[PDB]
């Protein structure tokens, strides 16, 4: 197997067709589904599977009380068959820790899991089912990483970490691994004030990541990373169509090199495909919560500080709950262009639905079409009254 290569570009995105949906919480009430969160999807040269941060307990067992808490020594990164539920009996632990990312370079997969206490965390980098590198904390304050698949070009897989304040400046680095080994790293540059939970996609030997400015931005920082030169850049989506959340209502004009003010010390992982006129943004429907989800065509959203939607597509009604969301693509599907894809973690339970003591989710993902398909809504589907 040769190392992959971001040879193609994104296809014309006109519609988002359904790709996967594991009714995990539905089935979970009468099956052995693990409690999870922070899911995402990735593909190897012959499969695409779901991934998530398990909580080391199923949904119906007594050990689910307290799963809101997102960091404990009982969490592992587990992977699983596309669209099936994460069941104890079918899941496959990948590494131990409560923050991750994973990409397949062509030859093998690289998985990274971060574990430890807030001030003393470490990231052990597995490459091919074996640990190979470790990196201890630098700012001793919740060393965290992507929470969604990473991208690799000819053997190099850029990946973004952050160690520090989640409500003030911090220290982020772009580590560049090859077969598990650190080829180099570098501190964040560009105009992005704060980076967190980067969603990266690849195409045309260049990686693009859209992240979360938890500190001051309602718009989102972007990082154009070059896999070969091993450099990178940052700024913000100029668009006044704000996509973070919480977020103030939509302005007429937007900020390009500085964060859009109004709401601070909060946000959600999100993503976007920036392809000139071929650009779509994803965002929650509520300006105050992670309820509903939508996709919108906003041409030149990255450069144009006035760009407004020209097409749309709902995914989750406002009344339904969303959560984290990100990108991923089958870099191995036969074709002349990479079909853009994404997933939205449908969050069920606490803090919103507090009739239960747990917090868990289910996934719904989609890929692009060149057809102008009709839209359908995709809710989690479970009835919280049944777990009482």
């Amino acid at each position, epitope marked *: 197997r040769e190392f992959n290569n971001l040879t193609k570009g994104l296809c014309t995105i006109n519609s988002w067709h359904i790709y996967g949906k594991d009714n995990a919480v539905r089935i979970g009430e009468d099956s052995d589904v693990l409690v999870t969160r922070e899911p995402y999807v990735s593909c190897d040269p012959d499969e695409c599977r779901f991934y998530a941060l398990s909580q080391g307990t199923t949904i119906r067992g007594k050990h689910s009380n307290g799963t809101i808490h997102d960091r404990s020594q009982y969490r592992d990164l587990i992977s699983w068959p596309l669209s099936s539920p994460p069941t104890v009996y079918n899941s496959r632990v990948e590494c131990i820790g409560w923050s991750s990312t994973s990409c397949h370079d062509g030859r093998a997969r690289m998985s990274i899991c971060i574990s430890g206490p807030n001030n003393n965390a470490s990231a052990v980098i597995w490459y091919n089912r074996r640990p190979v590198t470790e990196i201890n904390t630098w700012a001793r304050n919740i060393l965290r990483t992507q929470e969604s698949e990473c991208v690799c070009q000819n053997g190099v897989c850029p990946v973004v970490f952050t160690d520090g304040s989640a409500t003030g400046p911090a220290e982020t680095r772009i580590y560049y691994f090859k077969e598990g080994k650190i080829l180099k790293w570098e501190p964040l540059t560009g105009t992005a004030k704060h980076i967190e939970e980067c969603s990266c996609y690849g195409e045309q030997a260049g990686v693009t990541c859209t992240c979360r400015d938890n500190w001051q931005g309602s718009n989102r920082p972007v990082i154009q990373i070059d896999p070969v030169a091993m450099t990178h850049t940052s700024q913000y989506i100029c668009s006044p169509v704000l996509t973070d959340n919480p977020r*103030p209502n939509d*302005p*007429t004009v937007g900020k390009c090199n500085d964060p859009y003010p*109004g709401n601070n010390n909060n946000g959600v992982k999100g993503f976007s495909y920036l392809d000139g006129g071929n650009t779509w943004l994803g965002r929650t429907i509520s*300006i*105050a*919560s992670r309820s509903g989800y939508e996709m919108l065509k906003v041409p030149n959203a990255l450069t144009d500080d006035r760009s407004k939607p020209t097409q749309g597509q709902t995914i989750v009604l*406002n*009344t339904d709950w969303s959560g984290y969301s990100g990108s991923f693509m089958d870099y191995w599907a036969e074709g002349e262009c990479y079909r853009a894809c994404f997933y939205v973690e449908l969050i069920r339970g606490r803090p*919103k639905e507090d009739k239960v003591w747990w917090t868990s989710n289910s996934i719904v993902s989609m890929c692009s079409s060149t057809e102008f398909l009709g839209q359908w809504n995709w809710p989690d589907g479970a009835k919280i009254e049944y777990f009482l």
Partner: antibody, heavy 122, light 108 residues
């Protein structure tokens, strides 16, 4: 005819708890965020929080994320607000209001109740 | 929070008069500003929303304008029934905030 009907005045002993009934009639209850507002001398008008009957979503004015707990009865079409641990300063006038943007947070408060005046005394 | 500056809590005028109330916001609220009239009993009514949109059944005489940080309500022919307090408010972000208010009175 949107009609947010609200009682005239509440009399409660200092340190107690209380519930603000805000019976809504005139549109699809389940479709509009319901807000609450306090009007007191000095501070003036203040937003307490928001209850969305459609799915129970709530958000509070950080300065009231203790004093108030929003809720609502979908059957009787009433929104509620229970204030915990009443003091002299709690004496003001509380209004429940409907959103112009329905589920959105724009379009101002298109419709207001008449206001409940809360009193704390002995 | 976004502070709503309403400078002038008292405005004398005479019936027939074209009065103008002004409002100020700490930051650029991008037009997400409304105006409320509270008649002397307690009735808080909405007149203009999103800077210039009149609400349903609101006298065609009431005006609203302003951009950036400064906005303003313009009452054309002051009628006795306009002698109330007007409050501007922003809904650009959460939390929502209101200005101090401006009590209209008669010059005699």
């Amino acid at each position: 005819q949107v009609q947010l009907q609200q009682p005239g005045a509440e009399l409660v002993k200092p340190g107690a708890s209380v519930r603000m009934s805000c019976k809504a009639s005139g549109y699809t209850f389940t479709n509009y965020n319901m807000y609450w507002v306090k009007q007191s001398p000095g501070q003036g008008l203040e937003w307490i929080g928001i209850f969305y009957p459609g799915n129970g979503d709530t958000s509070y004015n950080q300065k009231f994320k203790d004093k108030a707990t929003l809720t609502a009865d979908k059957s009787s079409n009433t929104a509620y607000m229970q204030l915990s641990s009443l003091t002299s300063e709690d004496s003001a006038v509380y209004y429940c209001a409907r959103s112009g943007g329905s589920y959105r947070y724009d379009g101002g408060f298109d419709y207001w109740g008449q206001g409940t005046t809360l009193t704390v005394s002995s | 929070d976004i502070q709503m500056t309403q400078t002038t809590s008292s405005l004398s005028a005479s019936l027939g008069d074209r009065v103008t109330i002004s409002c100020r916001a700490s930051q650029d609220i991008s037009n997400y500003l409304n105006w409320y009239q509270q008649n002397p009993d307690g009735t808080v009514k909405l007149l203009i929303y999103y800077t210039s949109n009149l609400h349903s059944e609101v006298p065609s005489r009431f005006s609203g304008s302003g951009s950036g940080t400064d906005y303003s309500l313009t009452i054309s022919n002051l009628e006795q029934e306009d002698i109330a307090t007007y409050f501007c408010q922003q809904d650009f972000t959460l939390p929502f905030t209101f200005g101090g208010g401006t009590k209209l009175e008669i010059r005699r």
